[PDB]
Amino acid sequence: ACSTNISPKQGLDKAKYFSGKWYVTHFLDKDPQVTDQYCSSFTPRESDGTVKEALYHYNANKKTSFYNIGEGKLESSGLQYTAKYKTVDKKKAVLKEADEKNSYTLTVLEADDSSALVHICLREGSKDLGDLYTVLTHQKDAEPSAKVKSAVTQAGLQLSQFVGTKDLGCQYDDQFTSL
Numbered sequence: 016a017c018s019t020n021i022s023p024k025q026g027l028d029k030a031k032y033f034s035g036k037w038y039v040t041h042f043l044d045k046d047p048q049v050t051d052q053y054c055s056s057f058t059p060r061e062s063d064g065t066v067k068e069a070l071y072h073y074n075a076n077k078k079t080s081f082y083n084i085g086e087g088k089l090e091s092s093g094l095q096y097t098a099k100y101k102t103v104d105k106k107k108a109v110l111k112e113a114d115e116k117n118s119y120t121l122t123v124l125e126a127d128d129s130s131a132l133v134h135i136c137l138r139e140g141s142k143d144l145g146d147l148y149t150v151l152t153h154q155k156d157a158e159p160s161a162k163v164k165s166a167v168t169q170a171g172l173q174l175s176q177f178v179g180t181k182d183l184g185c186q187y188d189d190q191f192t193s194l
């Protein structure tokens with residue numbers, strides 16, 4: 016099951032989260048139903064409580080990439096949204112529209128000018144498929160801020176227990192994520 020004690024940090028300036036693009040420097044997957052390791056980057060934007068984000072995954076083992084577009088509504092709680100998502104090709108052509116069974120809930124635990132910490136619960140129907148914490152930065156392999164490192168320790172986690180993506184030979188598609 017996804018981790019239970021997850022609520023958005025109150026007082027967060029949303030302009031810092033919905034900013035630039037994010038690259039995942041570190042991830043923590045509690046119970047990886049696969050052993051393949053991924054890199055990821057995404058570009059979150061918000062307008063009138065609606066979030067839209069182009070999302071990229073790179074499978075570091077197979078060296079393949081897949082693409083999605085998430086769309087969700089901000090909760091009344093703060094920087095937290097449940098997104099449904101399209102599946103697209105690298106040109107953003109829709110392969111599958113969003114549906115009412117598949118979603119993810121993203122919760123911003125910290126965000127500052129250079130870095131973020133977010134939690135993501137991926138669900139399909141009645142099932143939590145996967146729980147992830149991800150440390151984010153605005154450029155590939157940038158060092159996460161002290162503030163975000165402190166947020167990891169505040170979340171009850173050890174940053175050392177995360178998988179660091181730098182060693183994975185990540186490839187990104189910065190054209191896909193632009194816009």
Ligand code: HEM
Nearest residue numbers: 039042049052053054055057070083100102119135137149
């Ligand atoms: C390095 C960080 C991440 C890793 C390691 C990771 C890992 C994974 C894995 C293993 C899957 C299952 C893929 C499959 O076999 O079909 C997946 C799917 C998914 N992830 Fe991530 N992910 C990362 C970051 C993110 C982020 C930042 C988001 C959203 C902002 C996200 C949202 C999703 C969604 C929506 C799917 C389902 C795609 C589908 O069913 O086609 N992930 N991720």
